[PDB]
Ligand binder design. Structure first.
Ligand code: HEC
Ligand code: HEM
Ligand code: HEM
Ligand code: HEM
Ligand code: HEM
Ligand SMILES: Cc1cccc2c(-c3cc(C(F)(F)F)ccc3F)nn(Cc3nnn(C)n3)c12
Ligand SMILES: Cc1cccc2c(-c3cc(C(F)(F)F)ccc3F)nn(Cc3nnn(C)n3)c12
Ligand code: FES
Lengths: 384, 243, 122, 181, 88, 38, 72, 291, 48
């Protein structure tokens, strides 16, 4: 036996990265996974190198961040790497989920994987938000206030749970210290969920664009897909360098560089770009409780997607109507995100309500109806 | 509303704009001079220390002299005897007002925000500052009403701003002989404030250039190596010959 | 997810009436042609989701010659997708070769499963 | 066996051992470019560990010198470690006049350990397990390391104890009633 | 462990005896045989085939967005003020 | 063993980029501007 | 005279900016006339020239911004 | 297949805790492993609940700790749990290693396991010391100073590596912030080494007191050795409660409650009890590098 | 409170002392009666 297969650690590394039998037909969309891992890694690294100079205290938080920017060697680089890497992590995750939906990697054999992925997604945003509250800029403070107020909507426990999470009667030093600790940790719990996701993948292997069994033609992860992962990693790092060095603050919001004070409310309390699609829903639903319920449903309905997808064919590469519906869903999602950052204007409020309606209708109507109609069309076409 | 969002400032072709362009440190020194001469009356720059100017806009001796001019709160002899000391390079530049109400009462209630981060904390950054300083029209647009102790400047959100135009022509005597026009002073001040908000700008862009070069080389090499490794599979053929 | 029996039942429900067959059959043929799977050397049955105990059972019961032809078609499709090239119309799967070869076996497996469920549920 | 597909067009035109040599060249170039990029990134990150600009600015801080009782040992806080500025009288200088080429882990004299007897500067941190010595418990008449009982001479030389060296003398220069680090 | 994918010895694939595979050592083949022709012709073919499915949904969504944005802009301009009062 | 080539590439790229950057930004650097404000 | 005023007052005469300048003048004179009447102080809504002024400023900025810094 | 064996995660949990074939002859000394795991868990838990109230800044560190003790609800309980749980973690590890030496669990089949274990031990001390520096008591500050000074003994890199680790010219705010971050992290790297240790164990299984093959008579870890683990866990928690509630500061050093100041050296710079055996060696060897 | 003194007693003792009130941000320093939340003052403002 080769040493890479006898030794337990090298055996695991082999099973996952060297002789992992990936389908030969997987295109570059299947390299996002590893990319996401890299993103997580870099975030953690940057995060650690920020924890060494960041101060969790409310009065020292923003000043400590500026100390990192102005006084710490390479502190600006690490700060921007972390901030823009959050956005890039979510870009990779959104493309990850888009690939999963398009190529039907959410169907029966990997439903378990799907579920884990969904959890990770939620956890990730509940780590991103936390991080955004650490700098304690105007947007940071008011986003924390808005979210914690929304948590008050729960009838039986919402009246007193909000002080419980705050550590006080409003967002203050206990809140920022709590968010710092939970934000340093929750990514490390997510590192465990990532391993769980990888094992749930490894049990049944990875899908392929054609949506058929990959067992007919499998290739080892190494060298082929290792080098494809290298290509996508270098492309990702090149675009990441573009943003970090030549345009870092475009993804962020300028108001976050204003020291936060509860007495002054900014003209527009809006999340970073990649929370916009969800916050849009939170803006559209009148009831606060209903709003938060719909906001979390917009993610959790991914769990119902595998059961609402009555298609007998994996993926959409060979499915006209399914591809059309998926692309319309993607553009509706982009429109919802865009509406997320705008004020509450008439056409925008009605359009946000309609966009949320169609976003949920996708999962609960279109995928079932379209999938059944396409199965019928396939059979009644080939029947001749 | 158009007014509430504030007029969007145009994109001037800054000498420092562009991927490989660095700050015009002559303009940075001009802007620092204008700030010290004019903006120091209203706005503080707490997050900029004299040490930051060395090698940027002032020789170590010059910054040393400027710091020594000022008196800073020395650590009182722990017998509670308060005293002042000459400033050092490590001391942060003082603001005109010790605390907020001093400014507000001095400024009819409005608080001149710290400029050490204003460029990063406003849409358009340097363009916004330059337009705002030069945005004040001689006569406000007809029909608008200005509260007492307020001035109109369209680039400000809401149109009504507490600051009146301060960069009047030929205000400061530039030590380099450059004309001290209001536009020139506004450009210099905007460049200085952009440096203050992004002191790493020069090094940031240089490191970006290095990173782009290295990563582009790696990316091209990885494309070549991948197409390489995949030629056997790309060129793979099959034949299927049952009876 | 949808049982092959259910889709076959719906297709026969439609086909039994020329009023709807004359309208949908041309549309179905155009949809299958535009589906793009034929140009990759695949038949409709090759696209079916194998990872299901019923589908695995149906495949296992497939005759040797059909099984080998299916394996070659799947391998050719994987190679084409990998090389980002498509068979020309000459080498593409003509509409008449979409013989639905795997449907009878899938239906037999589905009938066995449904009989089991119905019998043990009483 | 059978007729193979014709690869004529796919075949390379280049030599058998040459194309693999070129493949080696580019694979190694990729590896070493990646190593250079990783070196740059790791160096940039670890450079954050080093002293930030604030700490560098705070150091080399002058001390408020001036008249003080002769023989009294003042204390300062230059670069964190205590600085035992002592204005040793002429008696201490005379005592140090006695040369010591033996029975001293590091033979030295006030010639190099101090610029002038009226202003003696010496870091109070000990040698083995750096600690603040007592200013009057020294067995040799100078500072004493309570942790190990080490005795520091009036000239800062280590007389007894686990001292690995002599009392380090900061790099502080002297001027007119001022300390110029 | 009835995993629908096994390891290399048995990946779960069915018997495939009558198929033969052929490849040339990359040490003997061109890396750029199709690069020039591919990057133009093949890329344009893929884009043309996949265009409609992106365009039609994009046209619909962007038309709705343009209508909404133009209406909002009209509302916040002076001529629309009265209607802004009427709608609200 | 590998560190040699990595260091060589680092030094080469650093010197080349520094020279090009200084030449392209010449007039805008502090070193060249200080003389005018002397 | 600073370059900014020269550029603004020469771009204001371009045919691109001419309609905006004419509209601004018409609106300012109209609003002055409207403010002349006694009810001007009581009217719930009073006309403003902010929109036309913004349009003219946008038009002149989009013409001067790529030009100004070459003078400075 | 039972659901505990088909599902991948329940399959792993079964392989490690339910059907793991432990030798029937293993006595209570083999239950320390799980105990250590519990300790780590509790420590991490306590640690997290301290990070929500601890301030890494040097000037706020000790004051924030006192805030935890006096103002935060149950803050005293969590603080003492963490502090005494470090000592109990090392007690369990010392008994763990003692069992390994006595019953020869370090021999050929598990040599790999051994080395990971050794690494963990080192890492753990390099997490404990760091934690002790966070409080920035007199003992904390002077221990940090002594250790960092000893690091300077390296000839070629020792002259400048010490400022590199400090973040300055002496133990100061950068040092304490750095230690807080690395100390929050290194236990989470150690959680990975613990998993690696468990796999290196699982490959060849666990030894037995008799020092012969357990394959003749193996029992599933559940229920037998699960309940033995519960017995040892309740005993450990009972003794841990004794220390935490009725005598918490006996294991610690009183001087650590003095706010640290570099100008005052305590009469005896000494580590907590469980670092004493190693520090003794450091005191005995004359040369600092040799030490 | 609840340890050695009734809430009223601690309130009275705190009100006896004068504590550094947050000066009106116009820089006018002033003192205030002590509250239960105020920390007990020391005899000396500082070390020397
Ligand atoms: C006297 C009063 C001055 C002087 C001489 C300067 N500033 Fe200003 N400024 C001042 C106040 C009280 C305010 C607050 C206005 C408000 O509505 O809050 C401002 C405002 C600004 C801003 C903020 C604009 C914004 O947030 O949208 C900036 C930027 C600014 N001022 C810049 C600036 C510059 C470049 C000056 C150069 C001399 C300058 N100010 C002087 C009060 C005063
Ligand atoms: C999935 C993992 C993570 C994500 C998605 C994430 C996301 C974010 C985001 C969006 C911000 C806002 C920054 C800005 O607005 O400019 C932020 C800030 C911050 N995060 Fe993270 N984070 C992650 C992990 C971590 C880790 C592991 C740490 C510490 C080890 C950390 C510590 C911080 C700190 C200290 C800040 C503020 C510091 C500063 O901006 O100067 N985060 N994070
Ligand atoms: C956040 C860090 C993540 C990591 C480290 C990760 C890792 C991976 C990897 C390496 C793959 C195989 C290659 C690939 O699909 O690109 C994969 C597959 C998959 N991932 Fe993730 N992923 C992450 C995020 C997610 C999330 C949040 C979801 C939520 C739905 C998700 C859903 C999927 C699905 C459905 C597959 C199967 C794809 C297929 O079989 O073709 N991924 N994951
Ligand atoms: C620090 C956390 C630790 C965890 C979670 C852990 C876990 C375990 C467990 C559960 C076992 C089997 C049952 C037992 O031995 O109690 C084991 C075995 C063993 N451990 Fe650890 N252990 C830890 C510490 C260590 C360390 C630091 C060493 C260093 C030498 C070590 C050396 C061993 C050895 C030699 C065995 C084999 C015992 C045998 O085969 O009888 N353990 N470990
Ligand atoms: C193997 C794991 C760990 C060990 C052995 C360990 C050990 C220690 C020790 C010995 C102390 C000294 C306490 C005293 O002197 O009273 C300490 C303090 C401290 N540790 Fe840990 N630690 C561990 C993990 C952690 C974790 C996971 C965290 C945070 C998540 C943490 C945060 C702290 C803090 C904040 C303090 C000082 C707080 C206080 O005492 O009030 N440590 N640690
Ligand atoms: C500034 C701000 C305003 C309004 C909402 C938010 C949110 C937000 C958070 C959650 C979650 F419950 F997941 F926390 C869900 C939906 C949301 F809209 N977050 N933020 C700050 C921010 N935005 N993006 N980041 C990286 N942080 C807001
Ligand atoms: C207070 C003190 C004095 C002297 C030495 C130490 C150590 C110490 C640390 C290490 C290691 F390199 F591993 F860090 C090795 C040997 C040692 F003697 N640590 N401390 C504080 C302390 N002691 N015990 N804890 C939980 N912290 C000292
Ligand atoms: S006191 Fe430890 S050696 Fe000087």
């Amino acid at each position: 036996m080769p040493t890479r297969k006898s030794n337990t650690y090298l055996s695991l590394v082999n099973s996952y990265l060297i002789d992992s039998p990936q389908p030969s037909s997987i295109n570059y969309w299947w390299n996002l996974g590893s990319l996401l891992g890299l993103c997580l890694v870099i975030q953690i690294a940057s995060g650690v190198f920020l924890a060494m100079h960041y101060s969790s205290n409310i009065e020292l938080a923003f000043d400590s961040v500026e100390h990192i920017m102005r006084d710490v060697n390479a502190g600006w680089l690490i700060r921007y790497i972390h901030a823009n890497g959050a956005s890039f992590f979510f870009i990779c995750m959104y493309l990850h989920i888009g690939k999963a939906l398009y190529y039907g990697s959410y169907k029966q054999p990997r439903v378990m994987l799907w579920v884990i992925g969904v959890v990770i997604f939620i956890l990730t945003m509940a780590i991103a938000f936390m991080g955004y509250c650490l700098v304690y800029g105007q947007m940071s403070h008011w986003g924390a206030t808005v979210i914690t107020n929304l948590l008050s909507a729960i009838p039986f426990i919402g009246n007193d749970i909000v002080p419980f999470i705050w550590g006080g009667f409003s967002v203050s030093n206990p809140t920022i210290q709590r968010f710092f600790a939970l934000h340093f940790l929750l990514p490390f719990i997510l590192a465990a969920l990532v391993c769980m996701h990888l094992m749930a993948l490894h049990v049944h292997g990875s899908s392929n664009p054609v949506g058929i069994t990959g067992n007919i033609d499998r290739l080892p992860m190494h060298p082929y897909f290792i080098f494809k992962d290298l290509i996508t990693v270098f492309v990702f790092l090149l675009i990441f360098s573009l943003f970090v060095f030549y345009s870092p603050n475009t993804l962020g919001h300028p108001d976050n560089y204003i020291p936060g004070n509860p007495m002054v409310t900014p003209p527009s309390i809006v999340p970073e770009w990649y929370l916009l699609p969800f916050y849009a829903i939170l803006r559209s639903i009148p009831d606060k409780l209903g709003g938060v319920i719909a906001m979390f449903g917009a993610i959790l309905i991914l769990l119902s997607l595998p059961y609402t997808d009555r298609s007998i064919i994996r993926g959409n590469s060979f499915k006209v109507l399914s591809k059309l519906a998926f692309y319309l869903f993607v553009f509706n999602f982009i429109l919802l995100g865009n509406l997320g950052q705008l004020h509450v204007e008439v056409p925008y409020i009605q359009l946000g309500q309609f966009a949320t309606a169609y976003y949920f209708a996708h999962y609960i109507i279109v995928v079932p109806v379209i999938s059944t109609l396409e199965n019928i069309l396939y059979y009644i076409g080939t029947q001749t | 509303t158009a007014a509430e969002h504030g007029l969007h400032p145009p994109a001037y072709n800054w000498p420092h704009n562009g991927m490989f362009e660095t700050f015009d440190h002559a303009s940075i020194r001009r802007g620092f001079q204008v700030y010290r001469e004019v903006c120091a009356a209203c706005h503080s720059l707490d997050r900029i220390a004299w040490r930051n100017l060395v090698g940027v806009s002032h020789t170590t001796s010059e910054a040393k002299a400027m710091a020594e001019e000022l008196e800073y709160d020395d650590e009182p002899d722990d017998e509670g005897k308060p005293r002042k000391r000459p400033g050092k390079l490590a001391d942060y530049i003082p603001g005109p007002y010790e605390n907020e109400q001093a400014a507000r009462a001095a400024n009819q209630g409005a608080y001149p925000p710290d400029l050490s981060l204003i460029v990063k904390a406003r849409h358009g950054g340097s363009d916004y500052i330059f337009s705002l300083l030069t945005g004040y029209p001689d006569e406000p647009p007809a029909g608008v009403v200005l509260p007492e102790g307020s001035n109109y400047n369209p680039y400000f959100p809401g149109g009504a701003i507490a600051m009146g135009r301060v960069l009047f022509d030929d205000l400061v005597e530039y030590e380099d002989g450059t004309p001290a026009t209001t536009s020139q002073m506004a450009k210099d001040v905007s460049t200085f404030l952009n440096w203050a908000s992004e002191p790493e700008h020069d090094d940031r862009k240089k490191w970006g250039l290095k990173a782009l070069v290295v990563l582009s080389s790696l990316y091209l090499l990885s494309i070549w190596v991948k197409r390489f490794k995949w030629t056997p599979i790309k060129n793979r053929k099959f034949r299927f010959d049952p009876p | 997810v949808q049982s092959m029996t259910s889709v076959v039942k719906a297709a026969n429900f439609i086909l039994a009436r020329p009023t709807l067959s004359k309208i949908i059959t041309p549309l179905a043929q155009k949809f299958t042609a535009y589906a793009g799977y034929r140009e990759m050397g695949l038949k409709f049955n090759d696209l079916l989701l194998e990872e299901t105990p019923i589908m695995q059972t149906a495949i296992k019961r497939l005759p040797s010659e059909l099984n080998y032809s299916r394996n070659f078609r799947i391998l050719t499709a994987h190679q084409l997708a990998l090389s980002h090239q498509l068979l020309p119309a000459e080498k593409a799967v003509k509409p008449e070769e979409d013989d639905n070869y795997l449907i009878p076996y899938i239906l037999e497996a589905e009938k066995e499963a449904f009989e089991k469920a119905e019998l043990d549920n009483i | 066996n059978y007729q193979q597909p014709d690869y004529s067009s796919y075949l390379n035109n280049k030599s058998g051992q040459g194309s693999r040599n070129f493949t080696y060249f580019m694979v190694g170039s990729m590896g070493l470019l990646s190593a250079a990029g990783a070196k740059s990134t790791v160096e940039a990150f670890l450079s954050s560990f080093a002293a930030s600009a604030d700490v560098l600015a705070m150091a080399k801080v002058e001390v408020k010198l001036g008249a003080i009782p002769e023989g009294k040992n003042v204390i300062i806080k230059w670069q964190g470690k205590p600085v035992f500025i002592r204005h040793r009288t002429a008696d201490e200088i005379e005592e140090a006049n006695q040369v010591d080429i033996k029975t001293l882990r590091d033979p030295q004299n006030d010639a190099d350990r101090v610029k002038k007897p009226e202003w003696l500067i010496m870091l109070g941190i000990c040698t083995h397990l750096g600690c603040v010595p007592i200013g009057e418990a020294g067995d040799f008449g100078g500072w004493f390391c309570p942790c190990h009982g080490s005795h520091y001479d009036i000239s800062g030389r280590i007389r007894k104890g686990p001292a690995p060296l002599n009392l380090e003398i900061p790099e502080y220069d002297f001027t007119d009633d001022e300390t110029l680090l | 462990p009835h995993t629908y994918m096994g390891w290399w010895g048995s990946l779960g694939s069915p018997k495939q005896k009558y198929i033969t595979q052929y490849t040339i050592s990359p040490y003997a083949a061109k890396p750029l045989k199709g690069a020039a022709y591919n990057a133009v012709f093949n890329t344009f073919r893929r884009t043309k085939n996949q265009f409609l499915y992106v365009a039609i949904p994009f046209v619909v969504v962007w038309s709705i967005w343009t209508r909404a944005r133009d209406y909002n802009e009209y509302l916040y301009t002076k001529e629309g003020r009265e209607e802004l009062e009427r709608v609200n | 063993t590998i560190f040699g080539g990595a260091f060589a590439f680092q030094g080469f790229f650093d010197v080349a980029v520094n020279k090009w950057w200084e030449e392209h930004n010449k007039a805008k650097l502090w070193k060249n501007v200080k003389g005018k404000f002397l | 005279a600073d370059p900014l005023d020269t550029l603004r007052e020469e771009c204001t005469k371009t045919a691109a900016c001419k309609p905006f300048d004419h509209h601004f003048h018409e609106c300012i004179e109209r609003v002055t006339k409207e403010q002349e009447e006694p009810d001007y102080e009581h009217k719930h809504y009073k006309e403003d020239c902010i929109e036309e002024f913004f349009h003219l400023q946008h038009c002149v900025n989009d013409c001067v911004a790529p030009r100004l810094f070459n003078r400075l």
